[model samples]
Target: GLNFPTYDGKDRVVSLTEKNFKQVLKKYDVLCLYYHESVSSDKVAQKQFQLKEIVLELVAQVLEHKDIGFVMVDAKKEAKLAKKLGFDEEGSLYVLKGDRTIEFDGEFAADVLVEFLLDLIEDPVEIINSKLEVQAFERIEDQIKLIGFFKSEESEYYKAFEEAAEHFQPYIKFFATFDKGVAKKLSLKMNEVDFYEPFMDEPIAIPDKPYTEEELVEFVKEHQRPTLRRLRPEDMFETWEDDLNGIHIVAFAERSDPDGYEFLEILKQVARDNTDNPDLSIVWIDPDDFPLLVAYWEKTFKIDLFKPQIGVVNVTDADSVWMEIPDDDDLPTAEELEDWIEDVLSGKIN
Candidate 1:
């Protein structure tokens, strides 16, 4: 069920107003102001509450740091302050340093927020000085880290690596080192890139002639796998549609229903088997989770959300192809689902 908790600024996060805005800014060397709308529709409100919780949790974790302050500002209530800060849109986190301001417009997750804050206090791309630091970075179990071993930080390749680091921002971790011994320990050449997946003993090297910003970015994008995505309240259908070139397959189910439970079990196995498939993006949508989109999706796919359904949606061109499961037959096996997916993608079935 869709539910939002009542946020009353009970945590360390202070409710900012126009009166105390400038004073709070002056009190802390680095201040983070979260701008949001107090009232919104159910869909917007749900995401708003989620973001607030994430911020509150982050504030609690970093409470020991007194130099940094976190505050929440209602754009509607503090219109003057919002205007002064040029914050027209809601749901944006702004970090104010001594004389500069940085905007964080990324995923609303704890790790992303922590990474963004860490970047404010430290370099976005960490400069590794020793083999010990390399080992420390390798121990990170989450998020794929990009490490560049350059002969010198002054080189153009390192500059490109630096630029790519900012491009990814709080989403991915980027590291670099100019230490010869450190590079040698990892068996990396003087000028090479190592892509470290989580918990991997060795890293995958990016082999190419040029190490330009575009080249590095392209390499990362190619290897990156955004597997098993879920529809969020903030998602625009066409946005993800364009990213996958519209090859998006979605399974609609209600977790509470018995039929949905069975279908979801099948979906889970199918998704696990096809994890390496890059062309297809599998999305799970509990119709009950998003009531507003249920009707829209029902209308688009021409299927009742009351029952579990699976289909291929070519969102780029608004083309949908559904799998017609036999009413009397048993639920699909993992192999059967894979075969169906292949048949649809191979143009053997419409």
Candidate 2:
């Protein structure tokens, strides 16, 4: 049985049954469907419940859009339809767009799902010609952007860049230019690809070329994000441990605190200032958001969360290298914070 709620007198996710399968297929140019088996055991029920949450979140994000339909079905109930549609796994999602069908094999997060859907709808890459357009593209600071400088559209590396663009799709913005003057202005050699991380001023270029599709994608994926990033709730340990390079300068703050807003701005400024220092990362975490993890963080980092604090942690061995703002100290300025970070990088704080 389906338990999807209603939105504006319509179900948030349409229930696909044996009867309405054909007509529903005819109703939309694009349709996304989730299939699951019966929940006989509590374990299975819990797993399905978690899977349902992902679908609900994904459905809510796309509900306002037109010309697309998102639906779910029980494999046992709609057994014939499942067989016809080639439903292989219990929690698989199938996206049908007219003549084509795609099975989503990525994580079941709403953000990833929406991006995947948008990738199917939009062009994989954009072309920029003049200096004005290229400068505007370079000015994008909030998202990752990459531009390929090719000698011509038919250049060997151009095909590789075009193929690599398909791999990133809607997740990262990709642009291409064939103008020689534009390439010279960007200081890129002909057939070179440059990557721009969020909140960064400089572009990291692919060192020397004869760029293969795999190598271009590898380079983009390697430096796609800022040295400073948010500590998200999903898989926090992996983010805390794997994403960062060395020392983790974690900033803890409460969203409701009056001073918290100013503190956040300072952190962002510090992040912007230290974009070149890849040895240590500046991570921001809202302690009030995760009540359950408070005990673990306190135990691991040996810090109090009642007040805002900055901690430099070594992820490899779970060691706290340093903590700032003892008792009555105000939030440090960006320059002061950068000075302390330089000390840490220079081994003066050990």
Global lDDT for candidate 2?
0.71
Full-model lDDT, candidate 1 = 0.69
lDDT of 2 by residue, 180-268 (tens): 77877877777777887765567777877869999988888777556666565433444555546466778887757857767777777
- Against the unseen true structure, what C-alpha lDDT does each candidate score? 0.69, 0.71
Candidate 1 displacement at residue 52 in angstroms: 2.9
Residue pairs clashing, model 1: none
Cα displacement (Å) at residue 54, model 2:
9.6
| TM-score (C-alpha, index-matched) for candidate 2 | 0.59
